[PDB]
Nucleic acid binder design. Structure first.
Ligand SMILES: [Zn+2]
Length: 29
RNA sequence: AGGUAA
């Protein structure tokens, strides 16, 4: 369930609700 | 839990 950030392409651990690197929320699309 | 290698 890891997820890729639309904004910076970082692959975020499933448990994160915001990107680890750029802080963009998972729902921000 | 675990972060840059994904
Ligand atoms: Zn990001």
């Amino acid at each position: 369930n890891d997820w890729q950030c639309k904004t910076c392409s970082n692959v975020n651990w499933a448990r994160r609700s915001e990107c680890n690197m750029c802080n963009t929320p998972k729902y921000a699309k």
